[PDB]
Design a protein around this ligand. Structure first.
Ligand code: NA
Ligand code: NA
Lengths: 103, 103
């Protein structure tokens, strides 16, 4: 309902975790689980490549269609670009239904 | 200068003409060229097929481009369609420069 493709076997969940690294333990044995760990975090890159199949348009509509377009006249900033502060932003929601089709 | 492609050997001129058909001539010989012809005209269909090579766009521009689009809101008629009188019309001139390219 929120939109999209419903899949019985969707892309799998990808779980990740930093392995706990004990800080020095006591010198004489104790049953209790360790609760003192070295403070750490991780970082790295991640890549996702997806192949999409397109269904080309085959319309005999004579007149031009509606199309998503960038604004023409001057503006303080560029839509879908960064700030003077380096902040990226999406000015508006962009749908998918521009071309038309008969029923 | 009016725009377009300059060709040393452009598509050839295609000339057409209805052959003159004499109306009855005099019964005794006369030097003069005939000047009395049967009234006629011709009609038929004509076809032109042209193959065009396209140079696809290869831009890394992140933000959307400007695009020619049909108007969104209601209107008395449809742009680039016929009249209630069956008259076709081109509401505006449509150029060719929407996508962008670096220098
Ligand atoms: Na835009
Ligand atoms: Na239009």
């Amino acid at each position: 309902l929120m939109g999209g493709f419903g899949l019985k076997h969707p892309p799998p969940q990808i779980l990740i975790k930093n392995t706990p690294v004990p800080a020095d333990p006591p010198t004489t044995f104790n049953q209790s689980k360790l609760n003192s760990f070295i403070t750490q975090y991780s970082t790295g890159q991640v890549s996702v490549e997806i192949e999409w199949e397109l269904q080309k348009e085959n319309s005999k509509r004579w007149n031009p269609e509606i199309q998503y377009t960038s604004n023409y006249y001057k503006s303080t900033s560029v839509d879908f670009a960064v700030n003077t502060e380096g902040v990226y932003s999406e000015p508006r929601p962009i749908g998918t239904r521009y071309l038309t089709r008969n029923l």
